Design a protein around this ligand. Structure first.
Ligand SMILES: O=c1cc(CCl)[nH]c2nc(-c3ccccc3)nn12
Length: 135
């Protein structure tokens, strides 16, 4: 077993969002993508197999999947079609995901809080909070 498995593994559904449109604006997502992505109610599937973590997002907008080893940079094509260099670490029980592209950076933190999995996305000074519960 691991901390990761106990905390995060499973299937999660989006229950609330705050400031997601504003976050996407800051990131540079265009109007039509923001509108359609903002309507999505994704299920997010986290699994662990050895050192490899997989995060899969299924929605009516886009289905995405990343697999990675903590601390090891990888190339990620985001749902909004940015080509980014990503590194994900586990810091004090929080999954911290940094994406770098075009001289820009954004950080996505995923943590447990009570029965929720809380996703905080930060771009410059703008934060969006997305709350998931077990499916
Ligand atoms: O709703 C979002 C938005 C972003 C980045 Cl824009 N990333 C993200 N990751 C997740 C998520 C939620 C639950 C489990 C795994 C991942 N939700 N989520």
């Amino acid at each position: 077993g691991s901390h990761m498995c106990d905390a995060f593994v499973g299937t999660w559904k989006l229950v609330s969002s705050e400031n997601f449109d504003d976050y996407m604006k800051e990131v540079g997502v265009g109007f039509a993508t923001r509108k359609v992505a903002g309507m999505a109610k994704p299920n997010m599937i986290i699994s662990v197999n050895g050192d490899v973590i997989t995060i899969k997002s299924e929605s009516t907008f886009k289905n995405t999947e990343i697999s990675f080893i903590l601390g090891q940079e990888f190339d990620e094509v985001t749902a909004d079609d940015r080509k980014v260099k990503s590194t994900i670490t586990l810091d004090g029980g929080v999954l911290v995901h940094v994406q770098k592209w075009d001289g820009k950076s954004t950080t996505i933190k995923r943590k447990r809080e009570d029965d929720k999995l809380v996703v905080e996305c930060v771009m410059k000074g703008v934060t969006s909070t997305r709350v998931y519960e077990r499916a």
